[PDB]
Amino acid sequence: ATVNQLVRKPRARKVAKSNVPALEACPQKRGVCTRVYTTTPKKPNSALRKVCRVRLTNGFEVTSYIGGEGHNLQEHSVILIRGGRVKDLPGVRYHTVRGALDCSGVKDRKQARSKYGVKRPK
Amino acid sequence: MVTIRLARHGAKKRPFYQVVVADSRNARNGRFIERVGFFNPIASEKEEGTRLDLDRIAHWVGQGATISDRVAALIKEVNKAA
Amino acid sequence: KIRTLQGRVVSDKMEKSIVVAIERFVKHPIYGKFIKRTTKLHVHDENNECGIGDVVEIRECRPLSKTKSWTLVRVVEKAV
Amino acid sequence: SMQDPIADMLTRIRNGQAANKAAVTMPSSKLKVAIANVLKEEGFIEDFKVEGDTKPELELTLKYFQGKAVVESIQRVSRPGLRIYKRKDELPKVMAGLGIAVVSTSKGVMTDRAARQAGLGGEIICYVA
Amino acid sequence: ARYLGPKLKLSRREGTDLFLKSGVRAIDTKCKIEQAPGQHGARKPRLSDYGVQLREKQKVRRIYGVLERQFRNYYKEAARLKGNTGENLLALLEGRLDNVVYRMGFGATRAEARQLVSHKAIMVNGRVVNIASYQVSPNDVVSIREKAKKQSRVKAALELAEQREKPTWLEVDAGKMEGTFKRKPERSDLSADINEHLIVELYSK
Amino acid sequence: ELQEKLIAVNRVSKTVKGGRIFSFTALTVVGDGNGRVGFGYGKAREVPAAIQKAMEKARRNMINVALNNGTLQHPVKGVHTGSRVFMQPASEGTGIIAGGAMRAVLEVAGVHNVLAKAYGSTNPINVVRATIDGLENMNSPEMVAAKRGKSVEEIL
RNA sequence: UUAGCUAGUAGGUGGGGUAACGGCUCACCUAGGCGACGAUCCCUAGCUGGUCUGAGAGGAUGACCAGCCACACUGGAACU
RNA sequence: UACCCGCAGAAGAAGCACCGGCUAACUCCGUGCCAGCAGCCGCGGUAAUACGGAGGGUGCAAGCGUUAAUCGGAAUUACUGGGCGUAAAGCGCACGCAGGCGGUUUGUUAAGUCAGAUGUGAAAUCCCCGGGCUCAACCUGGGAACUGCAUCUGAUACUGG
Ligand SMILES: [Mg+2]
Ligand SMILES: [Mg+2]
Ligand SMILES: [Mg+2]
Ligand SMILES: [Mg+2]
Ligand SMILES: [Mg+2]
Ligand SMILES: [Mg+2]
Ligand SMILES: [Mg+2]
Ligand SMILES: [Mg+2]
Ligand SMILES: [Mg+2]
Ligand SMILES: [Mg+2]
Ligand SMILES: [Mg+2]
Structure with a gap:
C-alpha cells in the first residue's frame, strides 16, 4: 500500500513449486520398473492406460505412463523417466522416453517417430 | 619484477600481442598494470600494426621496469622506421 | 579539509571512550523513500568530559582496542 | 490535519474547474504565490491575486476556453512522504511538451523548460496539462 | 542452406510472381498460378493478422533467397541501425x-x-x-x-x-x-507492394 | 472508399418459455486513413446482418482524432469500465505494436507508428470504447496554444 | 513458528609479542558491549566484472575468461 | 598450412516436427469410450479435418521435436504499475510509545537537493564509428557507457537543524 508500509514489510514474492519433484532439475532419470499395470482414467474418459510404478536411482519412487501402442516392459526393467504429467490420470506425473536402454520404440509407426523412438524405415 | 611484455589476445592461428606492463610473477594473459600499444604479426600493409606509447614506456622503464626481448626489438624497429 | 563526522553520544559508561549514534539520510533504492539510518561508532576520548545528550564531532583514525577507530575533535552544543 | 497546502490548492482549483466556478478563494502562501506566478506565465490560469494584510488570501480566476476547462489534469508529484529529486538530464516532460512539469530549484520556481534551459535540476512540484 | 524443390509451388502459394523463373515464357503459360498447391488449393479460407504477416514474410524470403536465421539476423541489423526498419531490411537484402x-x-x-x-x-x-x-x-x-x-x-x-x-x-x-x-536503393526505387509493417510486427510479436 | 474491419463476433443467446433462442452481436470499426474513426455494435440473427447493422452505426458515430502525419501527438491513456489502454507515439518504421481490438482501430484511424498496451479486462467491446475515448481526448499543439493563449513555437 | 547474546567479552592501567596499529595475550581496575535500523541461532550459498530474460524498472544466475577468496586423502602443528 | 592451379562427372551429400481453436496449414481409409492423443479448451459410444496409415500442405534446416531450468506475458507482489460495501481484503472500539507527516512569516547554516571540476568505477563485456581473415561468426583501434562513491567550489525556492 503506502510507501512506508512497503519499506517496513517488503513486497515479497510468491514461490511456486515444480510439478516434477522427483527429477531434481534433471531432464531424464534412469530407473528400474517395480509395478507394471494398467489403470482406468478419470471420467468422462475411460480406457486401460498403461502406467508403471518405478523407483528412480536417486531414491524416489513415482509412477510414469507408457505411450504408443505395444511395449516390452515388466518387473526389473531399466527405463528412462522423463518429465511430463497426464491430466486424466490422478497421480501420474512422468513418462518413459522411448528409444532408451530397454523400452524399445513403437511398432508399425511412421509418423512422429522422434517422440516414440522409431528408426527411419529403409 | 615489473616488466613490459606481450599478452596474446587474438584467436586460433590469429596472434595479437598487446604490450602490457605486468609483474613477472603474474600470468602471461592475466593480471597487468597498464597496457602500452599492441603488435600484430599477421596484419598486412595499410594497417597500423604497432601503437606502443614511447613516452609511458620510457616513464615505466625508468622506474626499474624491464623490457622483454621481443618488445625491445619491436621498439628498435619502430624507432628505426620513424 | 580532512574527513570528519558528527553524531550524538548515547553512552559513556567506559574509561576514555564514548558511544556515538550518527544519523544519515539516504534514498531507498527500490521505493525512492527518504528514511533515516543510524551508524553507531565506538569513539575514544581521553580525559573524559562528554556526558550523554549532547552532540559530538569525530575523526577517523587507527583502531585503538578492537573497534574504536575514531577520535573526538570538538565538542559542539554541550547543553543538556 | 492540513499537512499539504499545495495539494489543497490543486484540489481547490481542480474542483472549481469541474464545478465551473469563477474564483476560488483560499489562504495563500509564499509557495502558493510562486506557483500561481508560473500558472499565469504558462497561461493555464487567467489571473491570481493576493488580498490580505494579516491572513493573505489568494483569489485565482478560472480560465475557460469554449466551455472546456483550460487545465485538463492537475497532479501533485512530490507529496509529503515521497520526495522526488531529478537532475537536469532526467527532468520530466508532460504530454510531450504540451504540459508543464513545474520544477523548484535554486533560481526560484520558473518551470521545467526554463530549468532545462538554465541547466539546473531541482524537485518536481506539479504536473499541469 | 537453400530451397532445392520446385520454384513455382512457393509462388502459387504466395499468390504472385516471385521472379523465380527466367522470363522467356509467361508464368501463367508455364504453370497454374491462381491457387495454392495441393488438393485444397481452390478452397480459400480466411487468414488472420498472424497469417497475413507470415505470408508477407514468406513472400519476401522466397523473393530474396534467404532462410529464417539469416532473415532474423538481417531484421536485427535493421533494427539496430538507425532509420526505417523496413527500408533498412530491404537495403540489407x-x-x-x-x-x-x-x-x-x-x-x-x-x-x-x-x-x-x-x-x-x-x-x-x-x-x-x-x-x-x-x-x-x-x-x-x-x-x-x-x-x-x-x-x-x-x-x-x-x-x-x-x-x-x-x-x-x-x-x-x-x-x-x-x-x-551507386547510391543504395530506396523504398520508392523498390516495389511498393511489399508491406514492411507486417514484417516488423511479426518479429515484434 | 472508407476502410472497415469487424473485430469479433459473439453468440449471445436468450431463454424463452419454449426453450433458448440464439442471436449474434458484431463489433466493427470504420475509418478513412485519417483522424476520422468510429465503432459500431450491431445485433441481429446472423453474422452478415449483424455486421451490416454495425457498419451503419459505426459510420454515423465516427469521430475525429487530431493525429500527426504518421503517428500520434503525445502519449495518452484511456479508461473505460473494464479496460485501461495506454498508447504512445513511435518513430518511422516501428509499426503498430498493439494487440487485441486496438490494432484494427489504430490501423483504420491511420496511425502507422504507435505502441499500445492494455491492462485489465481485454474484451473487445470495452477495449474499443476505451481506446476510442483515449484517442478522442488527446490534444494537439494548435488546440493547446489556442486554449492557453500562447503560440506553438512558445510551447514546443 | 530464531527475543536475548557476550566474562577476553566492552573499555581502561601496566608489562611481554609480530613488520607495524591492535585483548594479538597474560596481570589489575571500571560492568560494560551488541539487539525490533534484527544481536544470537538454523538452513543454503564462493564474491565481483559479468550472463540470460525484460522497452525500462525488476527477476533469475556466476558456463568460458579475468580480479579476489578458500582448499591440496582428513585434522593439527611447526621449520627453511 | 591458408591460398591458387588442371582432371572428370550432377556425382559424394536432407532430414525432422505439425496440420480442430490458441497457431501457419484438410481430405480419404482402419478400428469403434477399445486401441489411443493431450500444453489448456477437450476429443474416441461407425468416421472425431482431434487416434493410427496414406495423399496433400505448413514450419525449420544439418538440423528438427521433447525433456531440464529462468523471465516476459503475469498490471497474477503493482516503487515504475493494483485493491479492501458486495469477487480476498477496515482490526469491535478507544488511548498511546517508538516511528511517519506536519499551519504561517522572517533571520542563520547548508545536511537532503542542484551545477561545475578532480580521483576512481581494472581489463574483459554492451552500444557507436572503422579495419583484417573471399564474407559473416571471430578478432581489433578510438569513442561512449560503467547510471556508483569520495573530495573541493557556489544556491537557498523546497525538506530538515
Ligand atoms: Mg584479564
Ligand atoms: Mg514481473
Ligand atoms: Mg582425491
Ligand atoms: Mg490442434
Ligand atoms: Mg486486484
Ligand atoms: Mg461471500
Ligand atoms: Mg468479502
Ligand atoms: Mg469499523
Ligand atoms: Mg570488414
Ligand atoms: Mg569495464
Ligand atoms: Mg526552514
Whole structure:
C-alpha cells in the first residue's frame, strides 16, 4: 500500500513449486520398473492406460505412463523417466522416453517417430 | 619484477600481442598494470600494426621496469622506421 | 579539509571512550523513500568530559582496542 | 490535519474547474504565490491575486476556453512522504511538451523548460496539462 | 542452406510472381498460378493478422533467397541501425552479391546468380567472392572472371534482363560485363507492394 | 472508399418459455486513413446482418482524432469500465505494436507508428470504447496554444 | 513458528609479542558491549566484472575468461 | 598450412516436427469410450479435418521435436504499475510509545537537493564509428557507457537543524 508500509514489510514474492519433484532439475532419470499395470482414467474418459510404478536411482519412487501402442516392459526393467504429467490420470506425473536402454520404440509407426523412438524405415 | 611484455589476445592461428606492463610473477594473459600499444604479426600493409606509447614506456622503464626481448626489438624497429 | 563526522553520544559508561549514534539520510533504492539510518561508532576520548545528550564531532583514525577507530575533535552544543 | 497546502490548492482549483466556478478563494502562501506566478506565465490560469494584510488570501480566476476547462489534469508529484529529486538530464516532460512539469530549484520556481534551459535540476512540484 | 524443390509451388502459394523463373515464357503459360498447391488449393479460407504477416514474410524470403536465421539476423541489423526498419531490411537484402548480380543480369534467376558467385565466376575488385550474402558497398565494382565471361548462360541472362525495368542504382556496362554500385536503393526505387509493417510486427510479436 | 474491419463476433443467446433462442452481436470499426474513426455494435440473427447493422452505426458515430502525419501527438491513456489502454507515439518504421481490438482501430484511424498496451479486462467491446475515448481526448499543439493563449513555437 | 547474546567479552592501567596499529595475550581496575535500523541461532550459498530474460524498472544466475577468496586423502602443528 | 592451379562427372551429400481453436496449414481409409492423443479448451459410444496409415500442405534446416531450468506475458507482489460495501481484503472500539507527516512569516547554516571540476568505477563485456581473415561468426583501434562513491567550489525556492 503506502510507501512506508512497503519499506517496513517488503513486497515479497510468491514461490511456486515444480510439478516434477522427483527429477531434481534433471531432464531424464534412469530407473528400474517395480509395478507394471494398467489403470482406468478419470471420467468422462475411460480406457486401460498403461502406467508403471518405478523407483528412480536417486531414491524416489513415482509412477510414469507408457505411450504408443505395444511395449516390452515388466518387473526389473531399466527405463528412462522423463518429465511430463497426464491430466486424466490422478497421480501420474512422468513418462518413459522411448528409444532408451530397454523400452524399445513403437511398432508399425511412421509418423512422429522422434517422440516414440522409431528408426527411419529403409 | 615489473616488466613490459606481450599478452596474446587474438584467436586460433590469429596472434595479437598487446604490450602490457605486468609483474613477472603474474600470468602471461592475466593480471597487468597498464597496457602500452599492441603488435600484430599477421596484419598486412595499410594497417597500423604497432601503437606502443614511447613516452609511458620510457616513464615505466625508468622506474626499474624491464623490457622483454621481443618488445625491445619491436621498439628498435619502430624507432628505426620513424 | 580532512574527513570528519558528527553524531550524538548515547553512552559513556567506559574509561576514555564514548558511544556515538550518527544519523544519515539516504534514498531507498527500490521505493525512492527518504528514511533515516543510524551508524553507531565506538569513539575514544581521553580525559573524559562528554556526558550523554549532547552532540559530538569525530575523526577517523587507527583502531585503538578492537573497534574504536575514531577520535573526538570538538565538542559542539554541550547543553543538556 | 492540513499537512499539504499545495495539494489543497490543486484540489481547490481542480474542483472549481469541474464545478465551473469563477474564483476560488483560499489562504495563500509564499509557495502558493510562486506557483500561481508560473500558472499565469504558462497561461493555464487567467489571473491570481493576493488580498490580505494579516491572513493573505489568494483569489485565482478560472480560465475557460469554449466551455472546456483550460487545465485538463492537475497532479501533485512530490507529496509529503515521497520526495522526488531529478537532475537536469532526467527532468520530466508532460504530454510531450504540451504540459508543464513545474520544477523548484535554486533560481526560484520558473518551470521545467526554463530549468532545462538554465541547466539546473531541482524537485518536481506539479504536473499541469 | 537453400530451397532445392520446385520454384513455382512457393509462388502459387504466395499468390504472385516471385521472379523465380527466367522470363522467356509467361508464368501463367508455364504453370497454374491462381491457387495454392495441393488438393485444397481452390478452397480459400480466411487468414488472420498472424497469417497475413507470415505470408508477407514468406513472400519476401522466397523473393530474396534467404532462410529464417539469416532473415532474423538481417531484421536485427535493421533494427539496430538507425532509420526505417523496413527500408533498412530491404537495403540489407538488396546488398547481397547474388541479388546485385541478378540486377546486373549475369544470371537468369537468383538461384543462378548465387551459383555463379559460388562457382568462382564473380570477381569483385579483383578478388573472388563465393558468398551469396556478401554485402556490396557503394562505389563497388563487380566483374566476371575470364573463364565465365565467354559463357552462353551469362549472355542469355543479359539479353533476357532487358525485358525487366533496369535498376536505377547500378551502372553496369555490358561491354566488359562489369557493374558499379551507386547510391543504395530506396523504398520508392523498390516495389511498393511489399508491406514492411507486417514484417516488423511479426518479429515484434 | 472508407476502410472497415469487424473485430469479433459473439453468440449471445436468450431463454424463452419454449426453450433458448440464439442471436449474434458484431463489433466493427470504420475509418478513412485519417483522424476520422468510429465503432459500431450491431445485433441481429446472423453474422452478415449483424455486421451490416454495425457498419451503419459505426459510420454515423465516427469521430475525429487530431493525429500527426504518421503517428500520434503525445502519449495518452484511456479508461473505460473494464479496460485501461495506454498508447504512445513511435518513430518511422516501428509499426503498430498493439494487440487485441486496438490494432484494427489504430490501423483504420491511420496511425502507422504507435505502441499500445492494455491492462485489465481485454474484451473487445470495452477495449474499443476505451481506446476510442483515449484517442478522442488527446490534444494537439494548435488546440493547446489556442486554449492557453500562447503560440506553438512558445510551447514546443 | 530464531527475543536475548557476550566474562577476553566492552573499555581502561601496566608489562611481554609480530613488520607495524591492535585483548594479538597474560596481570589489575571500571560492568560494560551488541539487539525490533534484527544481536544470537538454523538452513543454503564462493564474491565481483559479468550472463540470460525484460522497452525500462525488476527477476533469475556466476558456463568460458579475468580480479579476489578458500582448499591440496582428513585434522593439527611447526621449520627453511 | 591458408591460398591458387588442371582432371572428370550432377556425382559424394536432407532430414525432422505439425496440420480442430490458441497457431501457419484438410481430405480419404482402419478400428469403434477399445486401441489411443493431450500444453489448456477437450476429443474416441461407425468416421472425431482431434487416434493410427496414406495423399496433400505448413514450419525449420544439418538440423528438427521433447525433456531440464529462468523471465516476459503475469498490471497474477503493482516503487515504475493494483485493491479492501458486495469477487480476498477496515482490526469491535478507544488511548498511546517508538516511528511517519506536519499551519504561517522572517533571520542563520547548508545536511537532503542542484551545477561545475578532480580521483576512481581494472581489463574483459554492451552500444557507436572503422579495419583484417573471399564474407559473416571471430578478432581489433578510438569513442561512449560503467547510471556508483569520495573530495573541493557556489544556491537557498523546497525538506530538515
Ligand atoms: Mg584479564
Ligand atoms: Mg514481473
Ligand atoms: Mg582425491
Ligand atoms: Mg490442434
Ligand atoms: Mg486486484
Ligand atoms: Mg461471500
Ligand atoms: Mg468479502
Ligand atoms: Mg469499523
Ligand atoms: Mg570488414
Ligand atoms: Mg569495464
Ligand atoms: Mg526552514
